[PDB]
């Protein structure tokens, strides 16, 4: 109201207001962080070539140290406002896990090597580029669509199993190497459901009797199952997509 | 629906026309080369063959294998040709498939909209008829 | 009020904790820095260098810098110029200290170990 | 617990949780003391990070707070700032308030806390439930039934906040 | 001074008819030039027609070099067509009379196709369609950026999984461009079977699981997300246009009814006045 004289908690609130005004609302610091991340992403794309690497490996190490120390500085600044709020968050958990894995693999000896150092960096790149507005709405609804997609995946896999029981009857020890092993058979039926270039399989189970045999029966059974499952799966995918986006425009 | 197909179809065919006639003389050194071992050579030979192969790219069947069969051309650092055909196939396929499915579901939307407004008008007319029946009954 | 009772029990006045901690860190770090320059210049007994503790005191250095800055920020609003001068001076000496020891460490590479 | 705390018969009493923080620090560092990692191949010993644990913890146990109280008894008490032993702050009204405070992150999520404002007073932080406004002014009304003083909302006076005493 | 007369001339439909005729003859020139005989033989007609076409396009740039760039520098189709004119004029300027250090011939049918694009720049109905679909540019750019991010993530992942070990699988998860193209194919449905048969022999059993996981994320997410986003973006863009058209029709109907009522009231008043005066 009047605020004749401030108190200690008002001073602390004003300090936290200053701390959230900088580095969280100021576009300059976020732009600098994005510029550094884009520069090290350029160095990422400059990899897979020892001809550039032989004069860049030490600079690569230095920029790795720089990006690691600025990431842990940002994490410490987020921790400063409070560990409880940072721990109870949807994306700060992911960022903390990213920096924890990167720092442990850096300081402590680890077999994590390039296959962890580089994808973690590009995951941080994705996380930072989510912050700027004209990708956050689109990203927000991809994660909103996965709970409604999970039931579709569950139904698809259950139907896939209960029709693979029909599948494994005409499978095993004949027309083998893609119909046997009961996991290769499942994944090969998944390939044929994804529906591209299955005439290798068609020629594989071709010539049983050259006229009808089971070459008629099993082939038409699995063909109608494949076409029905593919149509139903694609329809359900686009249906869940249209439902959740109708949610985002509602 | 096919009455509603007025401008999108000629947009589709004119994009097909311009992209096919651009891609005629892009992989020219594919069909017009002295390589003995090749099997997709005739795909990029004639203008009609060019139409057929860009329609194949539009349908998006074995685009991987088409690209590897054109990779037998001496790789000139892929600076213009491979990115052109890849961009053409991806943009044309997704843009046209998406635009047709969007406009078809829009057609279903206005079909159901006019149906629903017809039933709403019928219900309003029924309410007015019942009210006027009360008015007539009180008028006797 | 009664600063006897303020300094006696149960609490400390706001700030003036991190400043004193930075002072004692400054004291122990002049001790080790003087020992390092002494043994690097004359007596030459590198087996008893601080070649063994190299990263934990660097961590102590940066956290002392942070606490000095944080105490300066927490004590600036007192409205008194002496406290601000105190905090700025201790921050400046700690920072120049840090640059000096970083330069000394970077000069002393070829004497520790090789990977 | 919803009915026990609103009356707060006569005095209130309060404490701090830095003892808790120093407690898990002491447990963690005592764990660190015995059988830590053996990184002599790293040409470094990491026993001095626990030495800083010693220092930070011992300093945090040096902050002992016996029963922070006031003169909030349901009388014409002056709300003088009272500790067992020493006493610091006194005031004829116009300093004790109960104010709602808000905090925001980069995303924009709002977190609501309460602070008993005054000359080095203690806050009114509720137990880990701040996502919605719920009822707000009802707890201020219970405080008003207690010894009606204030209930201050965010930003300036405007509306939606209550005052009982004013020094004009 | 004469700017009003020049604008009236450019608004006259005869000029546009001549323009469309010239660029349709250019389209026929491209049709005959994609053949071999007419490309370099019996080509005096080709030469004179091409000179006429480039003269017409020069006149186009001359009438677009006015003060109208003050609106051409912020609009859509206008900046598009002047950019098309620039990237038409410069390449045949450095190609037809080259005398320079260019690489080879690959931008002749491309130039002619840009001319055909300038032809199709007409048809105001297609212009309205372009306007109606033009608000999804930011959305498709965002989906393209998400796609590219996923390609980069799985590009570094496929490299780290199959090309650093250097025991085979080269030019599929090896070199960067070939790896990117194989990943684009795996994100599509094409080539997945032969790619799987190529990768299963490299003593990497979990590569099959990784590739099928990559398919079930990338292909489904990209295809279904794109078709959705376009479907309701266009649905909501058509909806507002249709409701606005119906609102305009309703306003016109209301105005006609009000005009009829005013005419009836005036007729009644005139009849009453004549009855009073007679
Ligand atoms: C924990 C905070 C307060 C920092 C305190 C750091 C203390 C514990 C560290 C920093 C500097 C260190 C000393 C530096 C140099 C020497 C000489 C060497 O031949 C043996 C170790 C010895 C004697 C170290 C003992 C531990 C030491 C005093």
Note whether A8 contacts C14, CB cutoff 8 Å: yes
Q: How many angstroms separate the Cα of A242 from the Cα of each of A8, A143, B97, B113?
A: 52, 14, 16, 19
Q: Are strands D150-151 and D110-117 parallel, antiparallel or unpaired?
A: unpaired
Taking CA–CA distances from C15, the nearest residue in chain A reads: A8
The CA radius of gyration of chain D, in Å to the nearest whole number, is 22
What are E131's two structure tokens?
């306007």
Q: Name the residue with the closest Cα to ligand 1, atom 3.
A: D52
CB hemisphere CA count around A4 (13 angstroms): 9
What is the Cα A155 distance to its own chain's centre? 22
Distance CA D125, CA A242 (A): 43
User: Could you tell me which of B72, B84, B78 has the C-alpha nearest to residue B37?
Assistant: B72
State the Cα–Cα distance between residues B2 and B111, nearest whole angstrom.
Answer: 14
E22 closest CA partner among E47, E55, E44: E55
- 3-state helix, strand, coil split of chain E in percent (to 5) is 80, 0, 20
The answer to whether D44 and D83 are in contact (CB under 8 A) is no
Chain B residues with beta carbon closer than 8 angstroms to that of E126: 7, 10-11
Q: What's the gap in Å between the CA of E184 and the closest CA on chain B?
A: 9
Determine the atom of ligand 1 nearest the C-alpha atom of D49: 1
Instruction: Determine the 3-state secondary structure of C111 from DSSP.
Output: coil
Tokens of C62: 């940066």
Q: How far is CA D71 from CA A184, D151, E64, in A?
A: 78, 18, 84
Residue B43 makes CB contacts below 8 A (sequence gap 6+) with B31, B49, B52, B53, B56, B66
3-class SS letters over B86-105: HHHHHHHHHHHHHHHHHHHH
Separation of alpha carbons A225 and A222, rounded Å: 5
Residue D125: helix, strand or coil by DSSP? coil
Q: What is the resolution of this structure in A?
A: 6.8
CA distances from D11 to C56, D79, D96, E238 (A): 48, 10, 15, 68
Pocket of ligand 1 (CB under 6 A): C 28, 32, 48, 50, 53, 57, 60; D 48, 51-52, 55
The alpha carbon dihedral of E96, E97, E103, E104 has a sign of: positive
Asked if residues B24 and B55 have their Cβ atoms less than 8 Å apart, the reply is: no
Cβ atoms of E112 and E29 closer than 8 Å: yes
The single residue listed with the structure tokens 């026990």 is D4
Cα end-to-end span (Å), chain D: 38
As given in the structure block, the two tokens for residue B89 are: 């196939």
Cα-to-centroid distance, D89 and ligand 1 (Å): 43
Tokens of E250: 């309703």
For E176, nearest residue in chain A (alpha carbons): A48
Phi-psi sector, E227: left (phi>0), alpha (psi -120 to 50), beta: alpha
- For the record, the structure tokens of E63 come out as 């009438």
- The number of beta carbons lying within 10 Å of the beta carbon of residue B88 is 20
DSSP, res B34: -
Cα A219 from Cα A200, distance rounded (Å) = 13
The closest of A106, A113, A126, A57 to E159, measured between CA atoms, is A113
Distance, in Å, from the CA atom of B95 to the CA atom of B102, rounded to the nearest integer, reads: 10
How many other β-carbons are positioned within 10 Å of the β-carbon of residue E11? 9
**Spatial distance between the Cα atoms of E186 and E189, rounded to a whole number of angstroms:** 6
Exposed, middle or buried: residue C103 (CB in 10 Å: 0-12, 13-18, 19+)?
exposed
Residues 6+ apart with CB under 8 A from D89: D80, D81, D118, D119, D120
Interface test with A, best of D14, D106, D110 (most A CBs within 10 A): D106
Give the up-direction half-sphere exposure of residue D133: CA atoms within 13 A in the CB hemisphere: 7
> How many Cβ atoms are within 10 Å of A174's Cβ, its own excluded?
11
From the list B84, B29, B25, the residue with the least C-alpha distance to B57 is B84
Residue D104 dihedral angles phi and psi, to the nearest 5°? -135, 150
Q: In a 3-state reduction of DSSP, which class is residue D103?
A: strand
């Amino acid at each position: 109201d009047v605020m004749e004289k401030k108190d200690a908690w008002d001073v602390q609130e004003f300090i936290t207001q200053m701390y959230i005004k900088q580095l969280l609302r100021h576009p300059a610091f976020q732009l600098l962080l994005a510029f550094l991340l884009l520069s090290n992403a350029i160095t990422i794309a400059l990899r897979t070539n020892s001809y550039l690497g032989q004069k860049h490996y030490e600079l690569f190490s230095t920029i790795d140290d720089i990006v690691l120390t600025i990431l842990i500085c940002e994490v410490l600044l987020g921790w400063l406002n409070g560990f409880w709020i940072f721990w109870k968050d949807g994306w700060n958990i992911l960022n903390f896990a990213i920096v924890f894995i990167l720092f442990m693999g850096f300081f402590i000896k680890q077999l994590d090597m390039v296959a962890i150092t580089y994808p973690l960096r590009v995951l941080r790149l994705v996380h930072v580029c989510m912050a700027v507005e004209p990708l956050a709405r689109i990203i927000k609804v991809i994660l909103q669509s996965m709970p409604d997609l999970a039931n579709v995946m569950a139904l698809i896999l259950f139907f896939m199993l209960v029709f693979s029981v029909f599948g494994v009857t005409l499978f095993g020890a004949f027309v083998p190497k893609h119909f046997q092993n009961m996991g290769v058979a499942l994944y090969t039926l998944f390939i044929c459901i994804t529906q591209d270039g299955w005439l290798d399989i068609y020629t594989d189970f071709q010539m049983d009797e050259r006229e009808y045999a089971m070459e008629v029966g099993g082939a038409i059974y699995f063909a109608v199952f494949i076409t029905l499952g593919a149509f139903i799966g694609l329809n359900l995918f686009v249906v869940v997509v249209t439902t959740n986006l109708e949610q985002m425009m509602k | 629906a096919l009455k509603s197909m007025t401008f999108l179809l000629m947009l589709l065919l004119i994009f097909f026309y311009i992209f096919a006639v651009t891609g005629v003389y892009f992989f020219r050194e594919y069909s017009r080369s002295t390589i003995e071992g090749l099997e997709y050579n005739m795909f990029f030979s004639d203008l009609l063959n060019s139409l057929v192969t860009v329609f194949i790219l539009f349908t998006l069947d074995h685009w991987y294998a088409v690209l590897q069969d054109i990779w037998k051309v001496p790789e000139s650092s892929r600076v213009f040709s491979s990115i052109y055909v890849i961009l053409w196939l991806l943009l044309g396929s997704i843009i046209f498939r998406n635009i047709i499915v969007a406009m078809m579901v829009t057609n279903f939307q206005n079909i159901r909209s006019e149906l629903s407004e017809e039933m709403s008008h019928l219900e309003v007319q029924y309410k007015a008829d019942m009210f006027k029946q009360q008015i007539i009954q009180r008028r006797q | 009020m009664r600063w006897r009772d303020r300094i006696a029990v149960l609490c400390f006045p706001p700030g003036l904790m991190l400043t004193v901690a930075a002072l004692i860190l400054f004291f122990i770090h002049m001790g080790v820095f003087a020992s390092d320059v002494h043994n690097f210049c004359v007596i030459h007994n590198y087996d008893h260098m601080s070649f063994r503790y190299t990263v934990v005191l660097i961590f102590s250095q940066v956290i002392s810098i942070g606490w000095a800055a944080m105490g300066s920020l927490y004590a600036e609003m007192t409205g008194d110029k002496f406290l601000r001068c105190f905090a700025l001076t201790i921050l400046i000496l700690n920072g120049a200290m840090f640059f000096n020891r970083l330069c000394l460490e970077f000069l002393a590479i070829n004497y520790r170990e090789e990977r | 617990m919803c009915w026990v705390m609103p009356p707060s018969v006569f005095v209130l009493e309060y404490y701090l949780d830095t003892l808790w923080k120093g407690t898990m620090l002491f447990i963690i560092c005592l764990v660190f003391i015995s059988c830590n990692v053996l990184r002599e191949v790293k040409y470094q010993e990491t026993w001095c990070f626990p030495a800083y644990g010693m220092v930070i913890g011992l300093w945090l146990m040096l902050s002992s707070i016996p029963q922070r109280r006031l003169v909030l008894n349901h009388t014409r008490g002056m709300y003088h700032f009272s500790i067992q032993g020493r006493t610091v702050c006194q005031g004829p009204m116009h300093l004790v308030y109960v104010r709602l405070a808000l905090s925001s992150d980069a995303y924009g999520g709002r977190f609501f806390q309460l602070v008993l404002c005054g000359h080095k007073l203690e806050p009114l932080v509720l137990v880990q439930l701040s996502e919605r406004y719920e009822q707000m002014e009802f707890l201020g009304r219970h405080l008003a039934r207690k010894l009606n003083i204030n209930y201050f909302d965010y930003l300036a006076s405007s509306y939606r906040h209550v005052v009982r005493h004013w020094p004009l | 001074e004469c700017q009003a007369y020049f604008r009236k001339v450019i608004k006259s439909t005869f000029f546009q008819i001549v323009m469309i005729t010239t660029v349709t003859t250019n389209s026929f020139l491209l049709v005959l030039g994609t053949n071999y005989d007419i490309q370099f033989e019996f080509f005096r007609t080709f030469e004179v027609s091409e000179l006429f076409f480039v003269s017409v396009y020069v006149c186009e740039f001359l009438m677009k070099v006015y003060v109208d760039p003050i609106t051409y520098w912020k609009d859509g189709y206008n900046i598009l067509d002047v950019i098309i004119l620039i990237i038409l004029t410069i390449p045949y300027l450095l190609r037809k009379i080259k005398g320079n250090h260019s690489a080879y011939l690959h931008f002749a049918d491309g130039i002619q196709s840009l001319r055909i694009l300038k032809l199709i720049s007409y048809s105001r109905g297609i212009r309205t369609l372009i306007i109606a679909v033009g608000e999804t540019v930011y959305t498709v750019a965002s989906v393209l950026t998400l796609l590219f991010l996923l390609m980069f993530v799985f590009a570094i992942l496929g490299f780290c999984l199959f090309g650093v070990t250097d025991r085979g699988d080269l030019e599929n998860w090896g070199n960067l461009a070939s790896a990117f193209f194989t990943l684009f194919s795996l994100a599509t449905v094409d080539g997945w079977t032969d790619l799987q048969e190529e990768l299963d022999k490299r003593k990497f059993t979990v590569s099959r699981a990784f590739t099928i996981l990559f398919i079930l994320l990338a292909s489904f997410i990209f295809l279904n997300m794109f078709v959705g986003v376009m479907i309701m973006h266009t649905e909501d863009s058509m909806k507002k246009f249709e409701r606005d058209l119906t609102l305009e029709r309703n306003l016109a109907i209301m105005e006609e009814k009000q005009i009829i009522l005013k005419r009836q009231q005036e007729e009644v008043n005139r009849l009453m006045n004549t009855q009073k005066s007679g």
